[PDB]
Structure formats: structure tokens, C-alpha cells
Amino acid sequence: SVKLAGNSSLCPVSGWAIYSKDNSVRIGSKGDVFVIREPFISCSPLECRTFFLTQGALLNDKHSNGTIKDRSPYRTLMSCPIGEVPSPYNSRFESVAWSASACHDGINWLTIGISGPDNGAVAVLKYNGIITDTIKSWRNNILRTQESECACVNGSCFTVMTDGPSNGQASYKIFRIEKGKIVKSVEMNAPNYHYEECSCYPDSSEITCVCRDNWHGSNRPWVSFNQNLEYQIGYICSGIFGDNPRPNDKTGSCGPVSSNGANGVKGFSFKYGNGVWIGRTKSISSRNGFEMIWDPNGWTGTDNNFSIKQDIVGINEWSGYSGSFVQHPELTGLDCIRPCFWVELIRGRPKENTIWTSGSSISFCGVNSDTVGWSWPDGAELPFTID
Amino acid sequence: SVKLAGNSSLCPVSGWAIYSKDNSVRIGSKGDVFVIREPFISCSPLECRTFFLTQGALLNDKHSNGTIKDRSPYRTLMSCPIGEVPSPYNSRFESVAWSASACHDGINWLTIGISGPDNGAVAVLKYNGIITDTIKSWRNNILRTQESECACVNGSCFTVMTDGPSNGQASYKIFRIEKGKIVKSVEMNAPNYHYEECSCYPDSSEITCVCRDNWHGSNRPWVSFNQNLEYQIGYICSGIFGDNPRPNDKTGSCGPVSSNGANGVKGFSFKYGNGVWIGRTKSISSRNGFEMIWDPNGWTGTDNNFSIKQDIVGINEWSGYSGSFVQHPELTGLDCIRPCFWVELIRGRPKENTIWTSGSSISFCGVNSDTVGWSWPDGAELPFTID
Amino acid sequence: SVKLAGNSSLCPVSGWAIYSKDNSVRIGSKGDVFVIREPFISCSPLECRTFFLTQGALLNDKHSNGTIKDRSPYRTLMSCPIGEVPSPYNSRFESVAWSASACHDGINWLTIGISGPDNGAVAVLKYNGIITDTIKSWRNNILRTQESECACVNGSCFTVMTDGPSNGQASYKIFRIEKGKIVKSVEMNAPNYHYEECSCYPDSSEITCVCRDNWHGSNRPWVSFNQNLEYQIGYICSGIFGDNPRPNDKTGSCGPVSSNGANGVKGFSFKYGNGVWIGRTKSISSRNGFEMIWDPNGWTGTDNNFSIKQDIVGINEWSGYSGSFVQHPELTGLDCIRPCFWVELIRGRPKENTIWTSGSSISFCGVNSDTVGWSWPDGAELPFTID
Amino acid sequence: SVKLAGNSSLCPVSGWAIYSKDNSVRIGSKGDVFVIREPFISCSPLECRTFFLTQGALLNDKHSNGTIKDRSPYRTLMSCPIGEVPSPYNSRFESVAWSASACHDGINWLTIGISGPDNGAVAVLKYNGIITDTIKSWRNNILRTQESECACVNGSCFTVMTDGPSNGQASYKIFRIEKGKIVKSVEMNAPNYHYEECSCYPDSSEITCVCRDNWHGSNRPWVSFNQNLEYQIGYICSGIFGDNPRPNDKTGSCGPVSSNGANGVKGFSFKYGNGVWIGRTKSISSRNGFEMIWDPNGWTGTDNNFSIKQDIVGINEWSGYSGSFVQHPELTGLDCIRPCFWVELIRGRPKENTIWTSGSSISFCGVNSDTVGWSWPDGAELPFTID
């Protein structure tokens, strides 16, 4: 076992090849499948796993009732092999959690699970499944984290947490973690910015996080930092607006775009110099569709001009959260960090007539070979028997 | 593989971080989950497992009928990874048993499973799943043991067994076990004491057991011993009374507290010099709630004064048995033996209107970092379909 | 990996300690559990497994209909860890089979699965799951084998097969198998003997098989042989008659006891010089109860006098087949081959009002420490929903 | 780990011994079993696995509705151990796919999964579960592949893909793949030939593929090639016609036999000089029965004369696709490549009155020891509850 280096740059990619699909909701009609949301993928140097927040309940059972609710003492962070349905028969228990992150440093898994009251939640950090640290809410207002993988470089792993309002100014901290122990943290000085649910990836020994402004931004905020937590902040400048909801595409801003800026969805993007690969919903107003868009000047430039779109989920189909995950050279044998992404396909409440909310997932990896657009949606027929 | 040393002292702890939650009863509404009681956790130098006594039946099936009953030829000791629901698809078979213990010496698992008639029960000891010894009832009155992990030091493991009445004087024996073979035993000379269901942990090469006085004590008895089975006995002196039922807190005794002393619940406590960490129910009269209390003078002093309470399960929620488990330095990389605990959350009979009784579990580990009180209860909605 | 020696003698045993119980039928009321019969246990130098003949169907499903029937193209030999219920989620596939045997030589598993028409059945031999030999019926009348483990000594494994009538003289062959290849066979010259379903175990470099005379013997036939297949034959002489059905105990014979001799049940016994440990049903007329009896002169002497009985299953409870299995020194660390046994607890047809027949299992290992009699029966409540 | 050589010739075989049977459809009546079709087997140097295209749904659940349909975004390539039922609790996720292939080079698994639109489908190649290449449709008309294992020789693996009409001339390409990367491809110049769903096996360092002519041939086309993709083409000359549908046996042709040539079924055959082992349906008009036929002159000669038939599935029972798989010397310890085959037993639509279509499987391996004909059919009773 050797620590992941994380010093190479992101692989160049022309399109996105399909990597996995679990069909969780379709299978959970009959099989014993957890009610989940906030899924994400992360890889060790030997496998990729799907992590997820269960609701302590199965699909099509009465305890799925009320699962629109975000935070309870029943929620647990669990994981299973990528592409398999999350069941009690194939899932590893990770942590008690209603917000989470996880990543592998090359030697062992770090998991981060936040539970406890809204006014005093505690993140429990584990390394190889042993508790190695805790951090308690410093603003007493829903201490919360990425809902996607943390990022590792040279034996350290990194994450972002938020505490305070989700509809106004809050407080955002970056953490350096070594063998599950917090060895440094910094509070970002980011007045008028809003960071939620960051998608963070390593690139050339530094971390780049693309997050969600749930306050007053329909473009996405970003924070980038090196191993010592020296950080910079901005918003993606492209007029191909990344959040949901958002306005129609038009001239962008390098600061938060107020139009349709309140609310949001977890997302990601990958920076390539001045260019950006953006994943987003197809609808400007709800969690429908998914597409990947290459804007060669979109990280730093404000026009609404792009060079490539690839369809992922059709406009009339349900999408949800999305996030980055990477495959490092130690896993792939490549000379670059391979970028991949996942999409959560949310079914049930609030859009559909059910007692429950749950999701399935799809994922893709970036390649420089031929790809195609299509739609790979959830495919379950709702409502279910229990509804 | 190397034997666990067990020579370091208990880690200092300021609070209890949440470690696991299985949601067994909620999941067993639909999934194939064993009817269980008497769960406990124990760790090897590589993983922690949940051990439990099944009823040879699944939740929501007719064979769960009558599972208030303690002893039958259908009960088996099985185990699964911590935090996973106990199913026939993820559980390792250990022993035929209606009372049990288990622990790992650093090389292999010892399990102890008692079965047979009330007038002549036999404990079957296994090391790495091979039968290595038996011990038969010496009082012909329900030979029985810890219902939690045994404790290992320097290649030997240790347990306590009781035979005789549960409402009067009985007989209590301590055993030293090496590779599943009993190499020494002693009968404790403890007139007017009652020991049931001991929670035993290693600390500085000696074993400390905190047990249940089911006869006439609402504080908890203790027995401590070294590897040669030279032992001392007492009761926890604190007026923060540890058993359930019990009286309201008041001046304690270093002997059995007669008030509300009959009956009891399995529990634990950790000794730190003159101080004690006590886990107990919140109700004085039934198995409701759970809390951890630090009394800095409570091992040896009789006042009802404490310095720290942390809530675990709310007063209006069902609790049940609780027990110690430790994580040794060989597992954690620490310089001390880490104390942890589990709580059984009992659902069904006798408190609820069901044909069945079963439990889920929560667990916590001691840390010297920030923690919080909350309630993490079972969460199943009873009755079930089968009722 | 090293070949099992099989050169030590059988461990001396005073009684039988309980080793496993699966509760298959009770669990299969709800869980996904195979309809099985003809279970047996066998151990490698690392684990013990339960082998069984499935009916290609689950309990409580319509395809369990008609499972009184012995031979079909749907039956498969599968295995799972000892004490676990045989499900499609925990069972390894071994062979297509309606009669079987299996054993581990110290390096790999041999399995033997017989399938095909009654007039031309073929045994398929596999070593480490690769087909290594076949043997075809030589009498065109239900080629069939042990339904329990084969026996290994010094890199060779041994079994017995029968072809011809089950109610008259048939033909019986002994086979020596090396890495799944038949290297020698002999036809036993045994006029007026009947051998079915042999329970064969190694002892002092030789194999002893105790079988079932389904023709005209209520005591059990035996055949013993060395590695070169030089063999001797006899019947257990004790008047503690071993088969079911049988007469009440009285003076025995060293030849087949005609009284109630037609029909039978698979069984076993262990030879200790002139003495014998006999396992048998408690009823003389049906598959009810189980008990172990030590007769110190019963291998070679004809009196109905015994020195020890231990109860296993009560007289009013269903039993079924039973068989030997051993644990060699390479597994246990002992200086002798440890004798163990299993009992099949048959439920459904023909004794009960169901569409189906299936079994659960119990097992025990011989020890020289304290033991007790009891009853550990199946415990399912019939009929089931599907009936 | 060492690359498979693939330089020895095919083992000589006199008959086919039964290797596995899963009973998937029978078990899926109650258990949680995927709706599948297009199953196939492939082996590593350590195990054999069943690969299959799921429909993202379970048997006896409403999402099995409409599963006669071939191509959807819900279909996934998954695998499980040979002989086990394909469930979400025992199946490894491989790829998103509605057409597939897989094989092991001695070091790692290659999988090939085709998904996307009919007018632009993309094959995603993975080596050890990491995406290593893609190939996009070059004729924009259902890019598609073997539905059975690819073939490996000396660190390279080989497959055939088709793009264009299934009822007229299409385009056929052969690919050489090294560690999941396409290192060479060639378009076969095969005017008036039709290649679908090739069964390809290694033999003496070359690959032989026997396929399906869905255009105008009731005998089977073949293509053989060496590692550099120098290829030859023909049709099996025997008058024992291999496809379904077909005419009654009569004088054959070395070119496509037009009589009943439209449509087809995936199949295989093994070449032994001028002779051929043919597997085929028993019915000339539908997917009923299965039999193996040795024609000692049938590869190159046109008579309808044969030397050996062995029955596999009875004339009145449902069959389906069939395919080759091999076991190399590195797995078996033999000096030749062992030929084996599988049969898909298709149940449901279009032949039966159900909402769904799914299959079970049987397999056999070639031996030079005694064998027998029989019928090992699916055995499920249709319709099911959901119908």
C-alpha cells in the first residue's frame, strides 16, 4: 500500500463514457433495497464504491414513509460496490450520518459522518473504520459537508464543511486530514459567497472544489487550495449557468448570478485552464435531465458560447444531485488523474405522488475516444405498492 | 498474528462519539432479519462484529411468535459486521446457544455458547470455530454467562458464569481460557452478592467486570481479577444508581442498595481511579432512555453528585441491555485501551402489543474530542403485519 | 496446502457436544431458503461446510410442489458454511446431482454428483470445481452414492457406490480417487449383503463405512478397506439395532437381522475396537427422535446391553438421515481424528400435510469433557402458507 | 498471474458431461432473481462465471413488464459464480450494456458492453473494471457483439462485432485487444455472408468463430483468424444443419443454405480437422430441445451422415441461445484446451403467456470418459403471479 500522489494533472477528455447504472428503484419494487439519497462514488487503488445515506428503511415498506425529511437519527452512511443496488445484504456500514464524505488516501478509507441535533451536530471521522477525530458545529446551525468524495494528495485528504444559514451568509471551513486526524483547518473569508455540498477533486497537487450557492447564485462557486490550505475563491464565469434553478443562458458573471440564484442542486465541474466541463440539469427550473457541456473559455470568461454538448438524461426525466469522482494513476496505470462523475436520479417526493423519496444512480468516466449522447434515466414506474 | 497485550490502561475520555446503528427492526419490517436479543459487540485486531442470540426465526414471520421466551433449542449465537442488520444472508454461525460470550485473543475468536436443559446446561467453547472445551452446570439451575464480550490479556481470555437462583444467592465462577481450553477456574466467595451478565474489560493487565444484581441491589456489583484469578469484589458506591429498576439518586452504598434492588438490566461501567463512567437507562422503573454519566468520585464514594451527563436515547424511547466493548492498541494504533459501549433497543413484548420480541442496536466509542447528546432510538413503528 | 495424513486413530469420546443448528425450515417460512434433502457436513483444513441436494426451488413457493420425489433434472448439489441456512444468496454451486458425496483431501475439494436417467446415470467428479472424471451406471438401475462425505487418507479419497435393486441383491463398488481421478475400483463380493448410503470415515490409514441395508437387515452393514482397496465386510453385531425400521432390542446378529429389515434410513456408527458408538432414531418404526448409544462390545458381540445413552432429538419429534463427519488433526491441532455427526430433520411429506418435503440440520462433535442430553428438533410449524 | 498461452489444441471429446444448472426461473418465482437474457459463461485461471444482460428488473415484479424488448438504457452486463442464480445479492456489476462479451487473458477480465442509441451505439471496454477503450458504431445500425466469451491467446483477446442490417448484408469487424485497448481491427470482406453473435474459441494459437446467419443461411457461418487478424471465412458444410430455423437434414452446402435461412439463433460448434461437434435445437422450427452431434466429416463435407448424438434438452422443452466456453490448461492442468458449452433456456414471451421474458442456464464440458443423454430443462411453471 502506497499513498496516492495526486501530483499529475487531469486527463484531457473529449466525452463521457458510461461507467455504471444500478437501477436501484426498479429493483427495490421487489428486492430488499435501501431508501437512499445523497449517493456518491469514490475509489481506492483497488475498487470503486457507491456511498449513500440510507433512511434506515427499505423501498416498498412502511418505514419509507416521510423520507422527504433530510435529518434523523436513523440515517446511516453505508457503501456497496459500484453498480450494485444498495441492499442490507451487500452494503458495508460506515457511519451514523445525515451528511457525509469519504475518500481513500491510498492506504485506507476515511469516512466522515455527521449526526446529532441541528444546533450541535458532530462529524465523526473514521480511518479504516476506527474513530480518529470529531469536529463539532461551530455555528450551531446544521454542520454539514460535501455529499461526495473528499480529495487526497500525498497522504493528506481534504474536505469543506458549512455551518449557518442555507439562505444567507454562512461559514465555510477547509480541513486537512491525515490518517483520519484533522491536522489543520481554515475558515474561508468569503463574504457574499455561499458554499454548499462541494465537489472537490485533486489536480496537480492542489484541490479544486465546485459547489452550490443556495443563497443568491445560479452559477457555481469554487474554492481551490494547496496542501497548506492557502486558498482562492471565485464563481464560474460562464454564461452556461451551472445551478438548478437558473435563468436561460446569457452573459455570465465571475461573481454570484442573482437571477434565480436562491435554492440550488449539488453539482460539479472540471477546470481545464480557462475552459470548463459543466454538468447540469436540462431544465432551468427543476431537477430534470442531465447534460455535459464543454466551454473552452467558461472558467474565466462570461460569454454563453460553447463547443460541445453531450446528453446524459432526457429533459422529461428525473435527475438530481451530481458529483465528481476521480480515478488516480495508481488505479488506472495512466499518467493523469481521470475525471468521472455520477448523477443521482431522484424518485418520489416532492415531484411524485408517493410517501417516500429515494434515488438510483448512473456514472460516467471521461475519455479521449468516441462517445455518444443518450438518456439513461431511473426507469421505475411510480407509484409503488406501499403508496 | 500476535496475541493482544492488554497491559495498557484505559484511554481517558470526555464523551462518547456515535460508532454504529443497525436499524434492524425498521429493516426487518420487509427484509429478512433475524429475531434477536442479547446483542453485543467485540473486535478482532482487524474488524468489529455484532454477536447476538437469534430465535431461529425472522421478523414479520409466524415463527417469531412466543419470542419473549428466553431459552429454547432453536436459539443460536451468530455474528455479523458491526452496523449491518443480522440476516441469514450476512451472518456467520457461531454456536447453539441461549446465553453466550465471545472475544478475540489476537490470533483467533473464542466463542462460548450455552445450550441444553435448565437443570443441566452445557457451555460449548470454540476457538476458531472448533470445539475446544465444555463446562457443565455445577448447580443445575440455568448455567449462564455475560451476554457481552469476554476480555483478553497476554494470550488468555476471561469470563464469568453464574449458576443458581436469579432472585437469591447463587454461585459465580471466573474462568481463564487459553486457545479455547479452560486452564483455571475459581468460585467467587461472595455471600450476599449477586452477579449476572457481567460486562468485563481489560485494563492494565487485569480484568474489571461490572454486572447485574438481580436479587437485592439497584447499584451494580463488580469483580476484578488478575491473570491468575486473584480477585476482589465490591459494588459501585455512587448514589447515581446504575441498575434498572432503581430509586431516585441519593446517597449510595458500597454494598448492595436494597431499595428497588430486585430485578435488573444488563449494564456496564468503566472505572477510572475513584471515578466512574456509568451508562444507564433514563427511567428509574423501565427500560426507557439511555445516558452516560461521569462521576469523578463514584467508584469509591457514595454521594449523588456528578460532573457530566451525555444523552444517548430519550426518556420516552425504548432501551434495553447495554455492555462494554474495547478496542485494543493493536487495532487502533493508540497507546491505551479504548472504551466503547453498545445499547440494545428492545422492541415488542412485554411493553408493546406484539407476538414477538426483538432488538436493534447502537454503539459509541470514547473520545477526548468534542461530542454531543441526542437520541438515537430504534424507530420502528409497531405493531407489524404479523401481529 | 498439505494432504491430510489420515493415519491417526479416532479420538476417544465420552459424549457429544452440540456443534451446529441451522433452523432452515423455520427461517424458510419467510426467507429465501432452498428446499433440500440429503444434507451432510464435510470439512477442509480451514472450514466446515454443509452440502445438500436442492430441489431447484424455495420453501413456501409453488415449485416446492412434488418434492417428495427423489430424482429430477432440477436437483443440484450445493454447499454453504455450517449452521447457515441454505439460500441462493450464500450457497456455492457444486454439481448437478440427485445423489452425491464430497470431501477435501487437504489441497482441494472433491465433489461427486450423479445425474441422468435411472437406466444410465453418470457420476461427475470434480476437483476444485473442474470435471476430472465420470463413471456411468454399470447395472443400469439408479447408480447412487453416500449422501455424506467421502474419506481421505494420504492424498487419496474413497467412496462407495451402489447400482441395482434397493429391495434385493445389488452391486457395490469401492473407489480410490486421486485429484478427482478414479485410480482404482473394486466390486465387493457380498452376496446376501445390502449396502446403501454409506457413512465412511478414516481411522489409522483405513476407511470404515457403516451403511444401510434396505433389503433385509435392521442392523447396519459395514465395509472396511485400506488404500489399495483390500476390504472386509460384516454387520454390526449389537442387539442395539441401528436401522429404522427395526425390532425392539434383543440378541443381535453378526449377519443381517431379517426382522423389520426391509426399508431403512441412512445412518452411521463409529467403531472403537469391539465397541461401537451407534446413532439411531428413538422410534423403532418411523423417523422420530435421535439418540447416541455406546455399546462397549457392540461391534463384535450380540447382546442388547449398553453403557451410555445420550438424547439428541425427542421421541415425538421428526428426525431423518444421519451421517458421520470427521475433523482431522490438520484442522484441530489434536493427535487423533475427531468424530462428529449430523442429523437431518425432515419436514413435510410423507408424514405431514404439505405439498413439499425439506429438512433442517443439527450436528455434534465428540468430546471427552462434560455433555448433556436434550432435544434440538426442527421447530417449524406446518403447514406453511403455500400448502 | 501469467497470460494464458492459448497455443495447445482442443481436447478430444467423446461426450459432454453436465457442469452446471442454475434453475433461475424456478427460484425467481419467490427469490430475488434478475430478469435476464443472453447469458454466457467464461473462466479465469481461478473460477468460471456466468455473465448476463439484466433488464434492470426482478422476476415476478411489475418492472419485468415488456422484457421481450432487446435494447433499453436499463440493461446491464453483470456476472455471478457459475450455477448460482443471478441476484442483486450475489452479482458483480460489469457494464451498462444491451450487447456484450467478456474474457480473461490470464491476468484480468476484459468486458465489452454496448449501450446508447440504435443509430450510434458505443462499446465500452474495461480491463479489471477500468474503462480502457471505446468503439462507436461505424454503420449507425445497432452496433452489436457476441453475447458469449471473447477468446484470448498470448496476452491478446479477440472479438467480432457487427453493424448494419440483421436481414441483409452488414459489416463485420474483428478486433485484437491488449489490456482492454484495441490494438488492431479489420473489416471482413464477406459479401453474401452474414455474421451475428459469434461463438469464438482459441485453438492452436488461432481463433475460430462459429456464428449466426440471420439473413439467408440455415447452416452456420465461420471465421477463423490468427493473432495478426489474417482471416479465412466459410460456412459449416454439413447437412446436419446447425441454425434454428432450418430444414430437415439433407445434403449441405459450404455456402449459406438459403432454405429456411432467414432468422436464426445464437449457437456454436467445435472444429476437429474435417469433423465437427454441432450443438443445436431439436426442433427445426422453434427454440425447443437441444442435442450435440458429432459429424466426423461435417466441417468440410456436405453429407447429412453422423456418428454420435447426445440429447441435452427434450424436443418438447424450451431452449434458446447456446455458446462455447473453454477451460485452458492454466485452469485445468491438462495439455489441451477443454471445450465446454452453455444453453440458455428461455421462458416467457413470445412463446408463453407472460408479460416478461427471462432465461435459466445449463452447461456441459467435453470429456473422454462415459456420458449419457437426458433432458435438463428449465422446469418453471408459467405463468407467474405477476402475469
Ligand SMILES: CCC(CC)O[C@@H]1C=C(P(=O)(O)OCCCCCCN=[N+]=N)C[C@H](N)[C@H]1NC(C)=O
Ligand atoms: C443546501 C444544503 C443543505 C442545507 C441544510 O440542504 C440539503 C439540501 C437538500 P435538497 O435536495 O435541495 O432538498 C430538497 C427539498 C425538497 C423539499 C420538498 C418540500 N415538500 N415537502 N414536505 C438535501 C440535503 N440532504 C440537505 N442537507 C442536509 C444536511 O439536510
Ligand SMILES: CCC(CC)O[C@@H]1C=C(P(=O)(O)OCCCCCCN=[N+]=N)C[C@H](N)[C@H]1NC(C)=O
Ligand atoms: C438475570 C439473568 C437471567 C436469569 C435466568 O435472566 C436473563 C434475563 C433477561 P431479561 O431481559 O431481564 O428478561 C425480561 C423478562 C420479560 C418478562 C415479561 C413477562 N411477560 N410475559 N410472557 C433476558 C435473558 N435472556 C435472561 N437469561 C437467560 C439465560 O434466560
Ligand SMILES: CCC(CC)O[C@@H]1C=C(P(=O)(O)OCCCCCCN=[N+]=N)C[C@H](N)[C@H]1NC(C)=O
Ligand atoms: C435406498 C437408497 C435409494 C434407492 C434408490 O433410495 C433413497 C432413499 C431415500 P428415503 O429417505 O428412504 O425415501 C423416503 C421415501 C418416502 C416415500 C413416501 C411415499 N409417499 N408418496 N408420494 C431418499 C433418497 N434420495 C433415495 N436415493 C435416491 C438416489 O433416490
Ligand SMILES: CCC(CC)O[C@@H]1C=C(P(=O)(O)OCCCCCCN=[N+]=N)C[C@H](N)[C@H]1NC(C)=O
Ligand atoms: C440478429 C442479432 C440481433 C440483431 C439486432 O438481434 C438479436 C436477436 C435476439 P433473438 O433471440 O433472435 O430475438 C427474439 C425475438 C422475439 C420476437 C417476438 C415478437 N413478439 N413481440 N413483441 C435477441 C438479441 N438480444 C438481439 N440483439 C440485440 C443487440 O438486440
Ligand SMILES: *[C@@H]1O[C@H](CO)[C@@H](O)[C@H](O)[C@H]1NC(C)=O
Ligand atoms: C508526479 O510525480 C511522479 C513521481 O515522482 C513524476 O514521475 C511525474 O512527473 C509527476 N507528474 C507530473 C505531471 O507532474
Ligand SMILES: *[C@@H]1O[C@H](CO)[C@@H](O)[C@H](O)[C@H]1NC(C)=O
Ligand atoms: C404515513 O404517515 C402518515 C402520518 O403519520 C400516516 O397517516 C400514514 O398512514 C402513513 N402511511 C404508511 C403507509 O405508513
Ligand SMILES: *[C@@H]1O[C@H](CO)[C@@H](O)[C@H](O)[C@H]1NC(C)=O
Ligand atoms: C509530500 O509530503 C512529504 C512528507 O510529509 C513532504 O516532505 C513533501 O513536501 C510533500 N511533497 C509534495 C510533492 O507536495
Ligand SMILES: *[C@@H]1O[C@H](CO)[C@@H](O)[C@H](O)[C@H]1NC(C)=O
Ligand atoms: C505495555 O507493554 C508495552 C510493550 O512492552 C510497553 O511499551 C508499554 O509501556 C506497556 N504500557 C503500559 C501503559 O504499561
Ligand SMILES: *[C@@H]1O[C@H](CO)[C@@H](O)[C@H](O)[C@H]1NC(C)=O
Ligand atoms: C401464536 O401462538 C398462539 C398460541 O400457541 C396462537 O393461538 C396464535 O395464533 C399464534 N400466532 C401466529 C401469528 O402464529
Ligand SMILES: *[C@@H]1O[C@H](CO)[C@@H](O)[C@H](O)[C@H]1NC(C)=O
Ligand atoms: C504473559 O504470558 C507469558 C507467557 O505465558 C508469561 O511468561 C508472562 O509472565 C506474562 N506476562 C505478563 C506481562 O503478564
Ligand SMILES: *[C@@H]1O[C@H](CO)[C@@H](O)[C@H](O)[C@H]1NC(C)=O
Ligand atoms: C501419524 O503420522 C505422524 C507423522 O509422521 C506421526 O507423528 C504419528 O505417530 C502417526 N500417528 C499414529 C497415531 O500412528
Ligand SMILES: *[C@@H]1O[C@H](CO)[C@@H](O)[C@H](O)[C@H]1NC(C)=O
Ligand atoms: C401441486 O401439483 C398438483 C398436481 O400437478 C396441482 O393440482 C396443485 O394445484 C399444485 N399446487 C401448487 C401450490 O402448485
Ligand SMILES: *[C@@H]1O[C@H](CO)[C@@H](O)[C@H](O)[C@H]1NC(C)=O
Ligand atoms: C502414502 O502415499 C505415498 C506417496 O504416493 C506412498 O509412497 C506411501 O506408501 C503412502 N504412505 C502411507 C503411510 O500409507
Ligand SMILES: *[C@@H]1O[C@H](CO)[C@@H](O)[C@H](O)[C@H]1NC(C)=O
Ligand atoms: C504450447 O506451449 C508450451 C510451452 O512452451 C509447450 O510445452 C507446448 O508444446 C505447446 N503445445 C502445443 C500442443 O503446441
Ligand SMILES: *[C@@H]1O[C@H](CO)[C@@H](O)[C@H](O)[C@H]1NC(C)=O
Ligand atoms: C404492462 O404494461 C402494459 C402497457 O403499458 C399495461 O397496460 C399493463 O397493465 C402492465 N402490467 C403490469 C403488471 O405492470
Ligand SMILES: *[C@@H]1O[C@H](CO)[C@@H](O)[C@H](O)[C@H]1NC(C)=O
Ligand atoms: C506472443 O507474444 C510475444 C510478446 O508480444 C511475441 O514476441 C511472440 O511472437 C508471440 N508468441 C506466439 C507463440 O505467438
